[PDB]
Amino acid sequence: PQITLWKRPLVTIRIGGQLKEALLDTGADDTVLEEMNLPGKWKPKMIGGIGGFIKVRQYDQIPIEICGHKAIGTVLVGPTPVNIIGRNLLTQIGCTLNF
Amino acid sequence: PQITLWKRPLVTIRIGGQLKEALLDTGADDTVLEEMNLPGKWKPKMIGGIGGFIKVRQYDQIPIEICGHKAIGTVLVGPTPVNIIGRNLLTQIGCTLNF
Numbered sequence: 792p793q794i795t796l797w798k799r800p801l802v803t804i805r806i807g808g809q810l811k812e813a814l815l816d817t818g819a820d821d822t823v824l825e826e827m828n829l830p831g832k833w834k835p836k837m838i839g840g841i842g843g844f845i846k847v848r849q850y851d852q853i854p855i856e857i858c859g860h861k862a863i864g865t866v867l868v869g870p871t872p873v874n875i876i877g878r879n880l881l882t883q884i885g886c887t888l889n890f
Numbered sequence: 891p892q893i894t895l896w897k898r899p900l901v902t903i904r905i906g907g908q909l910k911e912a913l914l915d916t917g918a919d920d921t922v923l924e925e926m927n928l929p930g931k932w933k934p935k936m937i938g939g940i941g942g943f944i945k946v947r948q949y950d951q952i953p954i955e956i957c958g959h960k961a962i963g964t965v966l967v968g969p970t971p972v973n974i975i976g977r978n979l980l981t982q983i984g985c986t987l988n989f
């Protein structure tokens with residue numbers, strides 16, 4: 792689809808059979824989800840945002856379906872203010888900026 | 891134009907006699923610029939993201955040129971690590987997400 796920006800670009804995602812709302816976030820390098828359980832090994836990671844750095848858990852090769860489009864890649868889990876889909880998965884689903 | 895997201899969507903913006911590189915950021919409600927001594931009235935504000943909150947100064951009705959497209963609107967000025975063009979201005983230059 793084409794998504795305008797007068798409202799937050801929130802989309803439904805499907806991850807581990809669970810539905811969540813997440814923000815399509817072109818300013819984010821990474822995909823970062825609020826606290827949740829995911830299966831498998833994770834690695835401790837630190838990332839930086841506007842307010843400083845936080846600790847996250849890094850899960851690799853996680854399937855997520857974003858607004859009906861399939862991605863498999865890195866998902867970080869931690870104290871993000873909102874679920875965000877970043878460029879690592881935005882590229883997988885073929886998302887571009889257009890004006 | 892179409893901007894892919896393999897790399898950060900940085901573009902050149904102009905605000906007065908200052909050209910700066912800024913992120914086209916669909917995840918940002920508001921436009922946040924690195925410290926600069928803009929003329930005119932402003933109001934204090936705090937905005938939050940990954941890592942917590944920062945203190946910014948809100949300036950209203952500031953003209954900004956973004957890739958040769960004219961915009962005018964609210965700009966938040968503060969200790970952000972990157973210049974961020976938010977939805978308030980992305981809409982004005984006709985920016986959409988597409989996949």
Ligand SMILES: CC(C)CN(C[C@@H](O)[C@H](Cc1ccccc1)NC(=O)c1cccc(O)c1)S(=O)(=O)c1ccc2ncsc2c1
Nearest residue numbers: 818819820821838840841917918919920937938939940972
């Ligand atoms: C986390 C998001 C919900 C919000 N952030 C926008 C993200 O795209 C930020 C942009 C950014 C900030 C600092 C440095 C670089 C880029 N991106 C990230 O937090 C982010 C960046 C890189 C990696 C990563 O994992 C996350 S934001 O920058 O924190 C932001 C911006 C505008 C705004 N207006 C009102 S509240 C508000 C918050």
